[PDB]
Amino acid sequence: TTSAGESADPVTATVENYGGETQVQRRQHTDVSFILDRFVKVTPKDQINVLDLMQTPAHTLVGALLRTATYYFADLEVAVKHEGNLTWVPNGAPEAALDNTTNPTAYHKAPLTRLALPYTAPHRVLATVYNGESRALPTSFNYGAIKATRVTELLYRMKRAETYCPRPLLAIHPDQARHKQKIVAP
Amino acid sequence: SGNTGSIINNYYMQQYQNSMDTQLGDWFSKLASSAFSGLFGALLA
Amino acid sequence: SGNTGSIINNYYMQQYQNSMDTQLGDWFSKLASSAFSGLFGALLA
Amino acid sequence: SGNTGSIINNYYMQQYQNSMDTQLGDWFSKLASSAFSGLFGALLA
Amino acid sequence: GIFPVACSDGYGGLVTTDPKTADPAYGKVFNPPRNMLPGRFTNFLDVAEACPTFLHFEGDVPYVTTKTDSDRVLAQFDLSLAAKHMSNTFLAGLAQYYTQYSGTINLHFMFTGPTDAKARYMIAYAPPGMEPPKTPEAAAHCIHAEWDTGLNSKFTFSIPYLSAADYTYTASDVAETTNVQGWVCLFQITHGKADGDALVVLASAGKDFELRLPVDARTQ
Amino acid sequence: GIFPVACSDGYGGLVTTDPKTADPAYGKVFNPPRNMLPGRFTNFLDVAEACPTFLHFEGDVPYVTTKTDSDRVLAQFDLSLAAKHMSNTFLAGLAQYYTQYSGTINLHFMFTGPTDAKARYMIAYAPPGMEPPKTPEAAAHCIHAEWDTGLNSKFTFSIPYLSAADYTYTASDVAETTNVQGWVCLFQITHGKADGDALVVLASAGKDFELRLPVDARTQ
Amino acid sequence: GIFPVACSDGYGGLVTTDPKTADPAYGKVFNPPRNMLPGRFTNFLDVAEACPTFLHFEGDVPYVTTKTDSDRVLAQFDLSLAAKHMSNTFLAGLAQYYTQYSGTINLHFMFTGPTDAKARYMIAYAPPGMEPPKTPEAAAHCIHAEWDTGLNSKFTFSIPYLSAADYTYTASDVAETTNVQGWVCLFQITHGKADGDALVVLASAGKDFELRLPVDARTQ
Structure with missing residues (x-):
């Protein structure tokens, strides 16, 4: 399949070009809404925790995969293991609010609280990166904040996720011709 | 829909579950499907 | 209705849930909607 | 079906329960049923 | 026998x-x-x-x-x-x-x-x-509107909503001092033997004003 | 009275x-x-x-x-x-x-x-x-395809999927070194006052490429 | 409010x-x-x-x-x-x-x-x-059946199911030695310069054979 080189028009070339017969694809597992819908473990601050999605470690699946989008949208769903009551204040709320129980507080129950949170940021779509500043991402980009006497385990889960303009994503760089990691074996 | 999977209809309204979207007044798929294929060539047997 | 939100019909009667009201024999909304608007003026282009 | 046995339809989709099979493009039973029977003989009373 | 759950x-x-x-x-x-x-x-x-x-x-x-x-x-x-x-x-x-x-x-x-x-x-x-x-000369280049005292004593003016975002925070942040939503300025073009006279001012919601996401932020 | 469960x-x-x-x-x-x-x-x-x-x-x-x-x-x-x-x-x-x-x-x-x-x-x-x-003479006996530089600068070639299994592992095992999926070799049949010129190469998914079973394998 | 159970x-x-x-x-x-x-x-x-x-x-x-x-x-x-x-x-x-x-x-x-x-x-x-x-003379009074070697080398014979109960245990009990299901006896009526020749025997299920109630009884 020759073509013009500079064009940047997509040119897929099937195996048909040399005999051979394209097969059936099934791609459910690399659907964005699907792949992003899992729990991912963030390392908490002892007490007040802003619920940023950028707090997710950029190596982890949900971490690094969310980072390919420059703009995204999701509803959140945190599962947090804590002592005392847990209290979530919306987005753009004084941090002093984290003390008033009328804010969606959840009373303690073994062995973790799991609750779904609405997207609540005043922008249409959040961003994984922001060139207002050439970290250093607008404070407004968040899902709210939680507080407990002690949060210990905290897990994010994106629901309904939408994603826009893909940015690069990058594998671990090998030294030998094959990155020869030890595969599960019977 | 995503990574949800139950046949029973959800207990809570919908407005209480998700946030409700609002219309006002997809691309990469098109882009992929538009991919030219085969040959610029005058093929031979 | 309020800050309730389930699709399933409630388990208890109704008389056992709320207190039942009784007819015998809204304003600020009207008041707001009645608000005069635009101009007392003879507007120019 | 197997060693399952409930009349209520399952709560989870199906794709989330089992793995979903895929057609592309039994024997011993046949074999057993094909078993010749009776006699090669010219039977007597 | 009984329905499992x-x-x-x-x-x-x-x-x-x-x-x-x-x-x-x-x-x-x-x-x-x-x-x-x-x-x-x-x-x-x-x-x-x-x-x-x-x-x-x-x-x-x-x-x-x-x-x-x-x-x-x-x-x-x-x-x-x-x-x-x-x-x-x-x-x-x-x-x-x-x-x-x-x-x-x-x-x-x-x-x-x-x-x-x-x-x-x-x-x-x-x-x-x-x-x-x-100064009013300068402000003339804003969304201004300008009136004068007459038989009709009142004058109402909507402050337009304009923001890059769709909503805007109700509260100030202790870090931010440069004022994120901009200003309103009330000037006085002229007056005629009016010195010492009062212009009482009042504020309300417009047709399209709307508040959202309740929060108890102490707030006394 | 109440529904047992x-x-x-x-x-x-x-x-x-x-x-x-x-x-x-x-x-x-x-x-x-x-x-x-x-x-x-x-x-x-x-x-x-x-x-x-x-x-x-x-x-x-x-x-x-x-x-x-x-x-x-x-x-x-x-x-x-x-x-x-x-x-x-x-x-x-x-x-x-x-x-x-x-x-x-x-x-x-x-x-x-x-x-x-x-x-x-x-x-x-x-x-x-x-x-x-x-050597290209030897490789001629593989699924090869061979092109030359012209007015059209690009050339795309699908690497066929061929395996005894239906899917193939994305990662190498530390035990296996003999390469289980085989090789691709890019040769250079001839060139004409071309010395020191570059052939930039790029790779994508085909129509029928598909990934499956997600896993977080550290992977930085 | 919520459904009691x-x-x-x-x-x-x-x-x-x-x-x-x-x-x-x-x-x-x-x-x-x-x-x-x-x-x-x-x-x-x-x-x-x-x-x-x-x-x-x-x-x-x-x-x-x-x-x-x-x-x-x-x-x-x-x-x-x-x-x-x-x-x-x-x-x-x-x-x-x-x-x-x-x-x-x-x-x-x-x-x-x-x-x-x-x-x-x-x-x-x-x-x-x-x-x-x-002895075969004696056994003649049982459900016997009797054949002879010819062009057809095989001969199949169903062992009838007969028991006072409807099913019968698959395993012996260590107490019982008198054999509860009875015996099969294979005799040899006559032979003709046949000495040292083998009669190989094999066993299968009939149309109506059936097993029931699984159990793991060590069973190696």
Whole structure:
């Protein structure tokens, strides 16, 4: 399949070009809404925790995969293991609010609280990166904040996720011709 | 829909579950499907 | 209705849930909607 | 079906329960049923 | 025999704000009748927009007097429901329970000088990202509107909603001082033997003003 | 009186990946509108195949220069998304989250010599179970395809999917070194005053490429 | 408000064998296709009856040689799937997982002497409650059937199912030694220069044989 080189028009070339017969694809597992819908473990601050999605470690699946989008949208769903009551204040709320129980507080129950949170940021779509500043991402980009006497385990889960303009994503760089990691074996 | 999977209809309204979207007044798929294929060539047997 | 939100019909009667009201024999909304608007003026282009 | 046995339809989709099979493009039973029977003989009373 | 069920973890903690109703205790009560009672309001923003309430200028007064000097600026303030000028309005009072807002704020100015005083006023709105105007000549380049005292004593002017985002925070952040929503400036083009006369001002919700996401932020 | 139920053991542990939704907390919110936004992608493999990305050859460069020696082998590498040559492609980058894959990998070669350089290249695919070819004469007996530089600068070639199994692992095992999926070899049949000219190469998903079974395998 | 339910005692322990399915964890997987694969069996008793398997007589052999003496008894054994003679059959092998059985056991005898050897054999079935026969004259009074070697080398004979109960235990009890199901005896009416020739024997399920109530009784 020759073509013009500079064009940047997509040119897929099937195996048909040399005999051979394209097969059936099934791609459910690399659907964005699907792949992003899992729990991912963030390392908490002892007490007040802003619920940023950028707090997710950029190596982890949900971490690094969310980072390919420059703009995204999701509803959140945190599962947090804590002592005392847990209290979530919306987005753009004084941090002093984290003390008033009328804010969606959840009373303690073994062995973790799991609750779904609405997207609540005043922008249409959040961003994984922001060139207002050439970290250093607008404070407004968040899902709210939680507080407990002690949060210990905290897990994010994106629901309904939408994603826009893909940015690069990058594998671990090998030294030998094959990155020869030890595969599960019977 | 995503990574949800139950046949029973959800207990809570919908407005209480998700946030409700609002219309006002997809691309990469098109882009992929538009991919030219085969040959610029005058093929031979 | 309020800050309730389930699709399933409630388990208890109704008389056992709320207190039942009784007819015998809204304003600020009207008041707001009645608000005069635009101009007392003879507007120019 | 197997060693399952409930009349209520399952709560989870199906794709989330089992793995979903895929057609592309039994024997011993046949074999057993094909078993010749009776006699090669010219039977007597 | 009995229907199996999986009592799941992570669910059915009491949550202070959850939709579910509680389990009844005592039944069959009938209230005394209360239909056609007077004065009902079913929405705080209906009460907010039917009923404008005073602004608070320096020395703790709802009016702003005229001035016989070279200065022309009657008042000037951040457009913030958290503002000091707004601090006694019903609208500010209600906004302290909600983290973000949107839409138009009206601003009614009632002149109350003697029948022989006269004046022109102006009201610009300067968007954020530049110093606010100090003079009417300068402010003329904003979304201004300008009126004068007559038989009709009142004048209402909507402060337009303009923001890069769709909603805007109701409260100021202690870090941010440059004022994110821009300013309103009330000037005084001219006056005629009007010195010492008051222009009382009041503020309400517009047709399209809306508050959202409640929050208890102490807020006394 | 009340409906009996059997709260069963072994069920309703939190499972990090379970389909069930969580219990709502705060209601009635309406998002700002985001229809007709630009650039949306609903599937990583749509983004993988619309947009090919560079290979990494020795000395850390995306191209492979020509050679004025007896040697003809421009490059040669295991067919492994875990490969060093693939290591910077988007496709390799995405494969590290999935344990097995299937289907065709495209491989675009763009010549970028001066209008007076010319060359023929070849690209064989040697299946596993024998040493890979060292010479084009030998490799001629593989699924090769062979092109030459002209007015059209690009040339795309699908690497066929061939395996005894239906899917194939995305990652190498530390035990296995003999390369289970076979090799691709890019040769250089001839060149004409082309010495020192680059052939930049890029790789994408084919129509039928597909990844499966996600896994977080550290993977930085 | 919420639907009351009574979480009952005595229910929803995990039971190793309960019908209920478990709660899914990871979804949307599609198997590689496996239709029209060869050799499928959906029932062990279909495999048991399509495929007869050897008996084990003394000195560990599947055949029973002829005898040039006054004795006529080729073999004689308890009718028990637990029997020593059955011990290597597939049928015995499968019965050790089930506590009771019913119906007909076939028993195929293939002669394998030279074309000039000839013989008559007999096969009686003596029901329990009397000593088993020692001579064909005596056994003639049982459900016997008697054949002779010819162009057709094989001969099959069903052992009838006869019991006061509807099913019968697959295993022997250590107390009981008198054999509860009775015996089968294979005799040798005559033979003709047949001495030292083998009659290999094999056993399968009949149309109506059936096993029931699985049990893991160590059973190696």
